[PDB]
Amino acid sequence: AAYTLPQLPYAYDALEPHIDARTMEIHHTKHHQTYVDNANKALEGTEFADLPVEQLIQQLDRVPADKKGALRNNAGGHANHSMFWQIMGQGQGANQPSGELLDAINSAFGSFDAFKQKFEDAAKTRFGSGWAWLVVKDGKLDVVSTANQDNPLMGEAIAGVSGTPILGVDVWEHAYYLNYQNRRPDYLAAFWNVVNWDEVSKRYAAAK
């Protein structure tokens, strides 16, 4: 079918203690796997099966109406997670961006420290399941969030927000409950340790 589960760029325990191996394993091999399987089933009937996922989710307006929900959720699931594994890494940096990106950040947010707050807040104040994102939007950076597996690539009409994600954090409870339980903020603070800013800079460039 269209989609398969990407292999991770690192081992299930590469991100310890920030994220636990068990969680990485379940998250990847079950949660992501299902988004993939279920998207594949949706794409069954359709003209859309050979599209790149990140293209597919920009065309939910074009797909069969009675598939739209299923694809939004599961194609969304797949796109969101495929990104997430790639913007994390072992042994990064204290870790921060530099270059064109650090400059972008400074202009849009004031500083990296300021950006980190604005990001953590979008993430904290996201109620129920969702994601928080750093997007490029008209060449300028902004921070935003989405419900469930919604992505800014799906446009304002569908996701409530818009822009191109270059960084995202899963704040579905499955992403952090085993290690941090209710302590979402503890999870968010640990996150910064494992961001791969090389990859995020990589995408700043593209998205420009």
Interface residues with a second copy (CB under 8 A) are 26, 30-31, 73, 127-130, 147-149, 172-174, 177-178, 181-182
Which string of DSSP letters, residue by residue, matches 143-188? EEEEETT--GGGHHHHHS--SEEEEEEE-SGGGTHHHHTT-HHHHH
Among a second copy, Mn ion, none, what does residue 170 contact (CB within 5–8 Å per kind)?
Mn ion
Is 50 annotated as a binding-site member?
A: no
- DSSP label at residue 94: -
Is 103 annotated as a binding-site member?
A: no
Amino acid at 163: G
Q: Which residue has the tokens 């636990």?
A: 20
Q: Is 172 in the site for Mn ion (CB under 5 A)?
A: yes
CB atoms under 10 Å from CB of 147, counted, come to 13
Q: Which is nearer to Mn ion, 105 or 144 (CB)?
A: 144
Instruction: Walk across the sheet containing 130-137 and list its strands.
Output: 140-147, 130-137, 164-170
Q: Which is nearer to a second copy, 86 or 129 (CB)?
A: 129
Minimum Å gap between C-beta 77 and a second copy is 9
The β-bridge partners of 169 are: 132
Q: Which is nearer to Mn ion, 172 or 204 (CB)?
A: 172
Q: Which is nearer to a second copy, 32 or 116 (CB)?
A: 32
Binding residues for Mn(2+): 27, 81, 170, 174
Q: Which residues bind Mn ion (CB under 5 A)?
A: 170, 172, 175
